[PDB]
């Protein structure tokens, strides 16, 4: 049974532009769409005009606004923003029926942060205080929510990829998934939930113990898979892999899909590939299994993703087109939005663990489905973690 009906279907968006939830800030409430980001820890909103924003937070209109008299600078891999710290009353209309006083970074300047047509005006960093900017004394939103209310210290995400392109009007009208705050809604998944420990509380860090491409072991020292860390990040589109793992994975994926030759630009994640309407050769592309450390000593489980997850639908014509949504990383493994689209992901902060189950909305075909299976006997899994 599904017990959180008020929060089911509260997300919109897509992997390439991010998934967002509606929130309100201030008194009277100012409605804004907010990017759900498990890869950062600041709550920040556009607070000044920007060409890609059609609304922004107006602090002078909020009776409950409190100025913290301090600036904040947040650089990300490519995008960045700077703003002014303050606090205000915050609510989530399709969330728990509570109002909390939270820190808000009012974005005054930004560069390649806001995305044209994404429909979001701010970001909700759901990770831990350790990585909050300027420092860990800036309480993240979720920490404030749990401290001020009876909301349990857990949230879960079901990101729903459509499996095809959504134009501007379609993406605004479509249900992009669910963020269940304080619980697990059992209607959002099939099979069982398997848990992996959160290695450390900064990013949502996990440990990958084995990798397979169509059942074939990538056969790398497991430390390579987590070099320098492995994280679950809804604020990044792609599955990102450490340089050496990416080189081994692409070589194996190419070998598995060898009946069709794709250009270098495709494997670099830059160029789209197209097939006549309905003819995408899903069967030629391999499944990818990531084995994760289990909660029981010497036990692991695996999550299996299809090309329907790692090939991101893009519009070109009546052709079905995609980009390869696996990228090289110099900052460790990133289980991005395309991977999370295959699963219902439980961020169980209370029990320092992350759960995975097959998503009720994952894209698949009549021959193969995503999977979450276990247990497997795995030795010396602690050695897989990088120091
Ligand atoms: C999601 C839509 C598509 N899209 C963005 C538009 C192309 C991408 O796929 C995309 C591609 C790449 C390459 C990177 C990122 C990215 O930086 N995402 C952040 C959120 C975000 C979402 C946005 F929409 C726009 C942003 F500017 C920022 C996460 O919080 C990171 C930030 N981190 C670091 O920078 C870091 C700090 C220290 C060390 C290493 C890394 C920590 C991990 N978590 C996103």
Cα–Cα distances in Å, from 269 out to 250, 320, 321, 378?
11, 17, 13, 33
Method for structure elucidation: X-ray
Domain limit, last residue, from 151, 178, 206: 151
Q: Which long-range contacts does 314-319 make (Cβ < 8 Å, 24+ apart)?
A: 314/16, 314/165, 314/272, 315/165, 315/167, 316/272, 316/274, 317/274, 318/276, 318/277, 319/274, 319/275, 319/276, 319/277
Tokens of 80: 């960045």
Mind telling me the catalytic residues?
37, 233
Q: Whose CA is nearest to atom 44 of ligand 1?
A: 39
User: Is the domain of 147 the same as that of 188?
Assistant: no
CA distance 362 to 342: 5
If DSSP codes are grouped into helix, strand and coil, which group holds residue 283?
Answer: helix
Q: β-pairing, 66-75 with 80-91? A: antiparallel
Domain boundary among 117, 132, 151: 151
**CA angle 160-162-165, nearest 5°?**
140
Residues 23 and 166 in one domain: no
Cβ proximity of 222 and 384 under 8 Å? yes
- Domain of residue 235: give its range: 152-387
Instruction: Provide the β-strand partners of residue 356.
Output: 194, 345
Contact 314, 272 (CB under 8 A): yes
Q: What angle do CA 353, 237, 273 make, to 5 degrees?
A: 135
Rg of the chain over all Cα atoms, to the nearest angstrom: 20
From edge to edge, which strands make up the β-sheet containing 371-377? 216-217, 208-213, 288-293, 299-305, 371-377
Residue 65 in any domain: the answer is: yes
| Residue among 179, 134, 133 nearest 9 (CA) | 179
99-111 and 43-46 strand pairing: parallel
Interval between CA 85 and ligand 1 midpoint (Å): 21
Q: Tally the domains of the chain.
A: 2
Taking CA atoms only, the protein residue closest to ligand 1 atom 40 is: 331
Kindly report the protein residue whose alpha carbon is nearest to atom 35 of ligand 1.
76
User: What is the CATH classification number for the domain harbouring 254?
Assistant: 2.40.70.10
Would you say the CB of residue 40 lies under 6 angstroms from ligand 1? yes
């Amino acid at each position: 049974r599904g017990s959180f009906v008020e929060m089911v279907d509260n997300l919109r968006g897509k992997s390439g532009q991010g998934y967002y939830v509606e929130m309100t800030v201030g008194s009277p409430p100012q409605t804004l769409n907010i990017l759900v980001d498990t890869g950062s820890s600041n709550f920040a909103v556009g607070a000044a005009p920007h060409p890609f924003l059609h609304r922004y937070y107006q602090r002078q209109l909020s009776s409950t606004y409190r100025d913290l008299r301090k600036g904040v600078y947040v650089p990300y891999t490519q995008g960045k923003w700077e703003g002014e710290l303050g606090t205000d009353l915050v609510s989530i209309p399709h969330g728990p029926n509570v109002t909390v006083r939270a820190n808000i970074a009012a974005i005054t300047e930004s560069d390649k942060f806001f995305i044209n047509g994404s429909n979001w005006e701010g970001i909700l960093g759901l990770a831990y205080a350790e990585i909050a900017r300027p420092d860990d004394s800036l309480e993240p939103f979720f920490d404030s929510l749990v401290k001020q209310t009876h909301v349990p210290n857990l949230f879960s995400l079901q990101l729903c990829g459509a499996g095809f392109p959504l134009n501007q009007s379609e993406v605004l009208a479509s249900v992009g998934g669910s963020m269940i705050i304080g619980g697990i809604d059992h209607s959002l998944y099939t099979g069982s939930l398997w848990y992996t420990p959160i290695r450390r509380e900064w990013y949502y860090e996990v440990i990958i113990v084995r990798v397979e491409i169509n059942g074939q072991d990538l056969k790398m020292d497991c430390k390579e898979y987590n070099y320098d860390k492995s994280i679950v990040d809804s604020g990044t589109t792609n599955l990102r892999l450490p340089k050496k793992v990416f080189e081994a994975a692409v070589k194996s994926i190419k070998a598995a899909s060898s009946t069709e030759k794709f250009p270098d630009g495709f494997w670099l994640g830059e160029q789209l590939v197209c097939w006549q309407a309905g003819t995408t050769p899903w069967n030629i592309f391999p499944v990818i299994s990531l084995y994760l450390m289990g909660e029981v000593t010497n036990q692991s489980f695996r999550i299996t993703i299809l090309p329907q997850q790692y090939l991101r639908p893009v519009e070109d014509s009546q052709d079905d087109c995609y980009k390869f949504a696996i990228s090289q990383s110099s900052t460790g493994t990133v289980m991005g939005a395309v991977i999370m689209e295959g699963f219902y992901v439980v961020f169980d902060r209370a029990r320092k663990r992350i759960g995975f189950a097959v998503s009720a909305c994952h894209v698949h075909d009549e021959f193969r489905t995503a999977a979450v299976e276990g247990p497997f006997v795995t030795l010396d899994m602690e050695d897989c973690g990088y120091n």
